[PDB]
């Protein structure tokens, strides 16, 4: 009984930044995310399950969404997306489309376009009920360099504040 206060809900494997190490290519150092294997005292490895929200954000940013219908067409196998979206019930798509920007001159317009796309795609974190106020701060024009820091606002696993305007996220058990 009284023990109750701890959800029996668990978390599955989570993709993590720099799980497979950096990859230098003389332009900089990338992250190459993947799955982190946590070892034990006596063999018995196990996949890690931390940073759930960042895991969803990586799953969203780093997967191509469906392309838009053009008169040119697409190769049967290049039109992006996931067939598993045919079975979900929330009536949404899976992935992002930052890599589908219609490039143009005057890189300020390209920056604004990428901002719009990244924000529209990351809003699915709030729509799923995992964060509350995800937001981006994409600001640069350089030659082509761009910085795109992302903030994923979260909660705790026990409602400690009374009288909020919104409504507790539906999945505040991941701790966001």
């Amino acid at each position: 009984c009284t023990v109750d206060v701890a959800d029996r809900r668990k978390r599955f494997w989570t993709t993590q930044i720099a799980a497979c190490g950096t990859s230098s290519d003389d332009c900089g150092d990338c992250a190459r995310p993947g799955l982190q294997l946590m070892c034990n005292g006596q063999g018995q490895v196990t996949v890690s399950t931390d940073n759930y929200a960042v895991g969803l954000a990586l799953n969203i940013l780093l997967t191509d969404a469906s392309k838009a219908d053009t008169g040119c067409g697409w190769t049967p196998g290049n039109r992006g997306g996931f067939w598993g979206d045919s079975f979900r019930s929330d009536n949404l798509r899976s992935g992002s489309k930052i890599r589908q920007v219609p490039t143009r001159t005057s890189m300020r317009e390209t920056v604004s376009l990428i901002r719009a796309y990244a924000l529209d795609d990351l809003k699915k974190l709030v729509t799923y009920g995992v964060a509350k106020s995800v937001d981006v701060d994409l600001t640069y024009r350089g030659s082509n360099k761009i910085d795109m820091t992302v903030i994923i606002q979260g909660v705790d696993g026990n409602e400690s504040r009374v009288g909020l305007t919104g409504e507790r996220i539906s999945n505040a058990w991941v701790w966001s």
């Binding site: 668990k10 599955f12 494997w13 294997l37 070892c39 034990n40 018995q44 490895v45 196990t46 996949v47």
Partner: protein, 48 residues
Amino acid sequence: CTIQRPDPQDLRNDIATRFSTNVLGGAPIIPESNEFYVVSLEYAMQEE
């Protein structure tokens, strides 16, 4: 029975061995973990 219905323990050992050789890269599994429960489900599904 009419197909074969192998010994349960042997079937679970084979399932766990496949999961360790493929996903965990050859290491055994922590009891009462996510992978342990995944293995148990698969087993139930193969039994069905």
